[PDB]
Amino acid sequence: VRYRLEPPPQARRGDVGAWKSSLDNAAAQLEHQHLRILNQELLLKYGDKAW
Amino acid sequence: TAPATSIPGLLSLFHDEWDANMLELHNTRTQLHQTRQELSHALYQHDAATRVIARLLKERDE
């Protein structure tokens, strides 16, 4: 449920510390996908003979 | 000392600080390129000041 990467809901919208939690999850998943694409590009660039 | 939530909570804490560090990646990168932008405009501002000073002294002597 956290993975779906969602900002604070109705009862959590107004409070900003909830948007600190959103900073945590949103930034974390952002760099998740960034280093993800890095690893994928790294293998499809390089990995072939390793496999 | 480690959580007696052993694989459930060990994995939840694994993920929690994994992503805390992945978040410390993003904010640090973010202020890094923010400052890269501010430096680019600062170098532009230096060059602009130089243009202004040259124009001013051109006005000065003539």
Add this chain to the structure above:
Amino acid sequence: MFCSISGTVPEQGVVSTKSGHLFEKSLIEKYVRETGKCPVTGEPLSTEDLLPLATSIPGLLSLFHDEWDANMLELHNTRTQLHQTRQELSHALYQHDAATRVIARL
């Protein structure tokens, strides 16, 4: 694990006690009878010296530790580049005064 001569993984690994190098039993047999010595170290190597002997958690945690260190080192050089880009910028904000007061001097 690979054969310490060929770069291909041994089908039947043997190990010389002296140097610990992993060799192929026929390949090490040949190099010893020709040379009597070790092909990587150069010490004397005999025919009896050799003993005939990704998804899993040890390798998986090696991969975790790998990505952890690589990330933190990339961000360590990134930390250095940020502090670089604000030492130069901070001397720039230092020097954004004479623009003002020289343009007040002209």
Add this chain to the structure above:
Amino acid sequence: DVRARKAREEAERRRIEELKKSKALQRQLPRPLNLDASAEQLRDRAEELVAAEMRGLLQHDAAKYPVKDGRDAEFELEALQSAAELVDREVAYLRSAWDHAKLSPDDYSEVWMSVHRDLIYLPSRQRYERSLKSEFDNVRADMEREAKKAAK
């Protein structure tokens, strides 16, 4: 020979010709993508002069070479250099004036980061003031893009 001698001269020219443009786009720092009387009178008005001609030179930079990505697929120099050395000279001046002398550029980084921590983006005002959901939705769209990229 003489042929390579004219090559010598034009190669010298191309040397200083690459050294021509701004050190800014010579260290490839990011240019904002879209270009779209008492002592006080003189200071304020000529500061606004600096702002105007910085906009001018920035649009000059745009007009030269604006990006070579897939989305897309006056003065001479040493006069400005004389201006720049006047800059750094009187820079040492106002350095020595507003004391600042011994204290360190890293605590200076502390001050910069501390202040530009509380500088928040008001998109309803297109400004920084001393909002967040706009920044998060931008993060979410960037992740949407990165996600489908890594997905293909």
